[PDB]
Symmetry: D2
Subunit: 480 residues, 4 copies
Amino acid sequence: HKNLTTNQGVPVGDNQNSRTAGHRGPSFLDDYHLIEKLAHFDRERIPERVVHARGAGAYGVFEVENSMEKHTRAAFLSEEGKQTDVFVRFSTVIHPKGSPETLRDPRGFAVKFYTEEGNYDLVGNNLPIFFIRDALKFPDMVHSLKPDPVTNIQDPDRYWDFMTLTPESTHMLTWLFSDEGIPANYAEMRGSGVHTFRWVNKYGETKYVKYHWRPSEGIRNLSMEEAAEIQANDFQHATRDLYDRIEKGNYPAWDLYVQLMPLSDYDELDYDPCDPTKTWSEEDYPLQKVGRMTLNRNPENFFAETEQAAFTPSALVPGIEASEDKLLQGRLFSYPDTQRHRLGANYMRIPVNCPYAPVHNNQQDGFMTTTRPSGHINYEPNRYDDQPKENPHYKESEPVLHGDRMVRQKIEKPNDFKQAGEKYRSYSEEEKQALIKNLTADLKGVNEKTKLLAICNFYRADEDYGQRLADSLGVDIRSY
Amino acid sequence: HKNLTTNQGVPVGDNQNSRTAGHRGPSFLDDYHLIEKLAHFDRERIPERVVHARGAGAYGVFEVENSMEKHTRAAFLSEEGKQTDVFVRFSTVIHPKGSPETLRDPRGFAVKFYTEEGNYDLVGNNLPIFFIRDALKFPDMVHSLKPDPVTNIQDPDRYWDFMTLTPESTHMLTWLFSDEGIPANYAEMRGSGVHTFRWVNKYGETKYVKYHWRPSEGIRNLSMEEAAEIQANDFQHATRDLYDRIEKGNYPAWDLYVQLMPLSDYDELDYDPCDPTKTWSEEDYPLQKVGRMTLNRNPENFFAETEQAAFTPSALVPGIEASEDKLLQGRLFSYPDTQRHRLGANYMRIPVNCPYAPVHNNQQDGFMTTTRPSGHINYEPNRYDDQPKENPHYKESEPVLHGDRMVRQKIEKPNDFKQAGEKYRSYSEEEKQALIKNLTADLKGVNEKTKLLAICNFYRADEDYGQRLADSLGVDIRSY
Amino acid sequence: HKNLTTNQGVPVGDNQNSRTAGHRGPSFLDDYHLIEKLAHFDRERIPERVVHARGAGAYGVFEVENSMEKHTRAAFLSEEGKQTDVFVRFSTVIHPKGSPETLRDPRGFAVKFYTEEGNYDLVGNNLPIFFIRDALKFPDMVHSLKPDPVTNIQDPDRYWDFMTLTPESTHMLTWLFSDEGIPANYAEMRGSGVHTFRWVNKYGETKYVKYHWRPSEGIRNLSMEEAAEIQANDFQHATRDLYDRIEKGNYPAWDLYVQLMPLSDYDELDYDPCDPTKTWSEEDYPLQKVGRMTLNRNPENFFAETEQAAFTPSALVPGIEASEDKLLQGRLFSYPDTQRHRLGANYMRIPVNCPYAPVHNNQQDGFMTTTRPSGHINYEPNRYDDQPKENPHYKESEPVLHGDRMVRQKIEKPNDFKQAGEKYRSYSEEEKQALIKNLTADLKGVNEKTKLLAICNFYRADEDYGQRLADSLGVDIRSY
Amino acid sequence: HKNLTTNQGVPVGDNQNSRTAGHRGPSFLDDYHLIEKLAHFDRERIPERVVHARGAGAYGVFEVENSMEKHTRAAFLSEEGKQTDVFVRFSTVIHPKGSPETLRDPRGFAVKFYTEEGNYDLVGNNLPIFFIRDALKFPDMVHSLKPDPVTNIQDPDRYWDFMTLTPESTHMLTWLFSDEGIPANYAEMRGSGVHTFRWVNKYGETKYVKYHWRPSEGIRNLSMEEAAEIQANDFQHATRDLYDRIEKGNYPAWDLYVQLMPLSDYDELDYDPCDPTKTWSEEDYPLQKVGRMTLNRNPENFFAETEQAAFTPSALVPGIEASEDKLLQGRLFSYPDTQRHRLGANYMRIPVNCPYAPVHNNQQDGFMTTTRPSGHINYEPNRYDDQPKENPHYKESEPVLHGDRMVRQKIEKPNDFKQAGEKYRSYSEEEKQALIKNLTADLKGVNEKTKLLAICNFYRADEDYGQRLADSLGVDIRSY
Ligand code: HEM
Ligand code: HEM
Ligand SMILES: [Cl-]
Ligand SMILES: [Cl-]
Ligand SMILES: [Cl-]
Ligand SMILES: [Cl-]
Ligand SMILES: [Cl-]
Ligand SMILES: [Cl-]
Ligand code: NA
Ligand code: NA
């Protein structure tokens, strides 16, 4: 048995009735419990994520099967059997909190590893490539996909205007308009790091790496009709499914594989291996098993832990570094930036975001300082041997720069269409039909000129691809 | 033709490429256009409304048919034919911003009238009563209805626990579990002030008043199966329908009626006329036509005008005052309190929220001061005849207090069940069948003891009502 | 020995050099440690307090000498010898952070008692009365006293305009313009509750109470010239003194006394005992010793503890209640209101603001949720016997209302001048000379009409008082 | 004559009395004017600037005497007689908002030019060099100079610990401990760009540039004793002096000069010309007159205009670019980053911060959106010719990078002592005595080892310098 109290710790005498002039009169200003309770209620909500606002979280463990020390000094990967706690958030992308999990969208697949050398965040999606290759375009792309700023409803005419004028999107659209554009839930779902990163070993040697997550449950997708039948009765079916699996002891898992590529392989490929519109061949750069992640614990509070969770691709650990990928480069900035706005300056002290490894530094103050700081010395260098100092065992690598000037210029070998064609041809006939069906339903209402440009882009990917789409849309492409 | 610019007004040379070390190298910090554009992107979102987060707005006009000056000095009601501009937001209640408009919920019906004596907000719902009668309970009620704080899914076991232990909710639930719990859209929908207010005329005479909005388009509702079939294909159908009517010149309208009641009728009744769980008889207090409101204009920008719209029941104008209704009393505080958090201290300068009437006062500063203030004199009294002064022609009435002490105590004559029984019996047989069906589907999974208490509450309302519900839930109540 | 780390817990390799294109080239965006460290620096500051921005804090203990249970059920006062931890902040009033502590101003004297029945804040000043008697005037008053909104310099012509048109200020000005307007430091200083409060005992009986703190160190004050000489060499002398006394073990202390007055004495006094422009005669309502407070510990971090400290007069504990004082009434609202803005919705979780008594309630979420919440049940009533419940042993009293109606009307018997005359006459001749001197230097540049009004107000207080001031300002008042 | 109103535009009946239960009873919650007026009061303050918090602003004009088009395409410099409007803020550095203007500190000298090609901010100080050369050290440097985080008082032991361990500070300390460390006011004061920037002409040719502002009123300083005498009677004397000069038509002015240096001179020098601890010889790189800035207009409101003013070194206009200076490089980021926090995401719409040049882009939303946005198209590329497009006439230059790797490494030729020794010798004997006096008073209480290191640093600058300082501090340095 417990008293209900104010936030001052005074037991509440009456949690039913306001204080008033007799039993039916107007209310008094001197009712501290009323005003405190209402004022906190009035302040419960914080801004949702700018994208990926709808999602669900879980905790688990990652266990190493094959140590990776030949290729990376990363501590969490250093020995067979090593277990590292994780927190994971899965999400849709474009619509707000509260929106259905049956809509077409990439899915987010964000993993926070609480390592002995700091937190490492791998901020992936299910699909392994992206629509764009430079972060300067990201607000433009998002604004085109988001609901129209007048009507508040998503408009294909708007995003297809953008995508068509951005032909590097063609590979990604070829994946997203398969039925994999609507994963059945979060458990039966692919994961991908998307970018190339750099792995750096104890000798200072560097390889390029890609990450892949393979579901123990298998990959399963929904047709447009299957999605509509679910949407009719449950607009949070994937959140529900994740929670329910874990509560029942049916823990979903993913095996982590990597591909590894010598830096020197740049020069003989017909694409840029750091162009995030590209995959790497699994025949030429085979998947290598690393370990397995199992999610086995639901959060205790959705707001405190899942809504407030903060991931960033710049949360890198020794042995794992960014590549030169221009899309990645902007993400390094945008995440902690948006998080300072969304969550406050001190968002890294929110429990789910805290490292297991020690934090010592000379930062101070900021809104909601709750950590009980002490000491006179908040600057370095200083004369005190016991105060925190830099440690040169933990320097990052020094990537070679091939460029001689500060430039704004597209990468060489963009190759916008080749891999889209390759993906198209890799589809079964049944898969090709679904792609054409899904594209047609999306394109049939859009501006004719934009519709034609879309057909043209897909035709450059593969002639059959583009001709089938033209036929299905009733567009005659003879004069071209 | 226009240049794309930074916020400094410098034309942008290249809106495609980040600044990098050659065409493929990493990105430079000295790229003001990238950082500015990303940072503003990262800050687009503000907190959504704590309740009624999903909604849609429109502008229009209210015209007086019958001047109301014998009963209220309100300027906007003073003459036949007098037109007043309005802004209106319609909404659901419980789920977040992107959530479907096919869910069961009251609907918000908020009207801002830009009058010559200031803005008047009538912050209504479609349904004419409420679940509770004291604002102290509102965070409890909402927390029970909202998604479970662990799972992020709404749970009937939670809100039926609260509602059953809050028997004053019994009238409201008898309306909400009719098919009127799911209006077809925002146009074919009732509106209500819910509370009794006080109207005060030029002689200082006061009557109690209730407001009702009657749709020109008629009232239409959805069965659970009809709601599911719409939900399958459109989670924003009511937002779409409002915009589309207005874009096509098919402007929806509502006629405004009032009921008026002498203060002295308090003793003539077996309920409190300021208990918001109660309606007033239309036989005994007939509806009197006031005028008509027609919505004819969509906003130019959804975020700036609809998302940032701020209404409050305390935005009263001369001749219209609060009643002693303890639920209303809390609302007077909570809206501008939540708005200061949600929108900023200076939220009343946001264009949609600005009055048409002049604003002059001694308030100053606050975040985002954009109004070009001037002058040395920001205090009153002051010796300067030209500075703003108080005006005694605009004093409020002085309501009589019947209570002799500051108390926390329920109103007398709560009468929690009588009007619920009356509403039940007023239903057609078809309507009664839908109510039972809708209650049953909601109750069938809840805790058995709570289930029984719900049945009991409805049985106290009407024996047939409660017995039918018990039969439909397979609960044997012989022996109570 | 410790590593400097990022907020991700990664050891920092180099805390001296930014990442750049060779040893002298421009900087890279991929420098997580630079960006994180700068971005947090950029966010260190929060808004200062709207008034009382300059101040200093200390911890200590209050011990009861005489139990107060005949008069109040307050727990912290129940027994001889009972010790309660306190936090205290002392302050100036008008100028910002960083301003000198040699300026004329009331001094704040704010005490938080961490009691077994919740936190009790007594938010006093050194002087025992105030300038105004209704909170509606507080922003006007402050704006007049604050630096001019154009020039950023305080202007006597502005605040004497307000004060002279607000004759209730006349008693307060009679104390503030003694040399007690400029206390020597925070230790050698009076403290006062200012307001009448209500004390309620175990039988439900109520008395009015005033609080007084008497320094162990005695009261000492600075002449205008003494203040200037300090200001020359130390603009933070009182913050320095408080810290230094404590660091050297010379702990300052105050004895707490009360006056007590029957409610019934209202009707036979020639002033309102809840008018905060009034004191109560110490002959007629003698000082009664309660206990002693000793300050013996400096805070560990000034920002986290003293800057973030939040006091409110509405932090009342059982046995201690507001009076009807209309100035007090506004404070109940304003403090927690400002604090939600200044410190965040969860400011009560900041360590210095936390109660020692347990906190349990159904509030949730809000910016910077750090407390690891859990559970499904965030609503009451609920079916769970273990969840927090109200406790009827802790109801507040029910003050009798003597008023008929909701009114906006000055109190009866304002008596603006009588006590100001009595205080004048109580001054030694030296003290009377200082008063006249300090008033004269402040008034001599003000608008002649405002100057004459000031003289009149003081002449109504006491003829000799007003005549002396007139003589000293060279103003001939014979014709009046 | 005007009505005082609420923010809803309702005339106020009574601005003196709260609404209460009779003339003396407690206060009612239904008092919208009280709550609104107090709640806005409670939200007036915003965070002060993290450094340079104490300052004053004025408007004026800059006029070109000698067109600069041979060296820069900057529009505002393109023709003789061309006038550009400016806003200017002057400041101190380390202490908070209300702190005295008589303290030792660099002074800020920030100029915002409202040009036809956008706003150009030149964010200078009075002194022409800085303490450090890499922005990574800036929060360290500030934390050491700021008041101790425990005591709230500045401590020379703390900043001298840092500066002595940061020998690059030696030149700057040599200027700051002359009596120029305390300018007499803001008018009689030097201005400096400090950094080398790049000027780029219409042919794409680049030179290094330094900026210098020469006061029409001359340079005048205060001794320590002169400063104390002013501080005794006025802690805002420079704020006062600037306002007063302008109000009486005694407009202060500064002539702008530049030095220009070929990029190819890097190897001809024994220091790095982009090391901000270094000046360039006026013999070798002569001062060239550009034009004159006159300040002739005080702001209308100090908060709206001066407190909310936002400058950034990254507000560069075509023809003027950053140099590789690593200190500059961090500032490009930190200013808009801190401003978004301090002022809100939309701080560029605050009037003083608005460009005169047109602003069009695809940014949207954010707190306090007051600009009435419209249109469907908030993304680029898009199919619409009339929407804003990039303009390739406004590309920035492409600086040559001399580095081949991403490194964290100090510049070559730091040369920490040489220019300090040159400055020392350039002082008159009277100036040398003041420098020694000021350094001695600052150093005499610091830790002995730190004291010795300071002496060593200054002795490396010049033997006489160091020996005089050692003699004056009583430190025997013969064994070294
Ligand atoms: C320029 C490109 C991109 C930008 C600018 C960007 C920016 C952002 C931002 C600002 C957020 C909100 C973060 C928060 O509020 O805590 C976010 C979330 C997210 N992004 Fe991205 N993103 C980009 C590309 C990508 C890519 C390529 C992926 C996958 C590789 C991805 C996966 C995600 C995920 C999964 C989340 C949600 C993380 C969570 O669960 O909280 N993003 N992104
Ligand atoms: C209508 C009257 C008043 C209003 C509206 C008002 C409002 C405020 C506000 C808003 C603050 C800032 C609080 C914070 O940020 O924590 C403050 C501080 C303070 N006020 Fe008042 N105040 C009033 C009268 C008084 C009175 C009568 C006293 C003493 C009797 C007083 C003593 C103080 C003190 C000591 C502080 C500083 C709190 C601290 O140390 O942190 N005030 N006041
Ligand atoms: Cl921010
Ligand atoms: Cl640090
Ligand atoms: Cl006002
Ligand atoms: Cl707030
Ligand atoms: Cl609660
Ligand atoms: Cl843009
Ligand atoms: Na191994
Ligand atoms: Na010329």
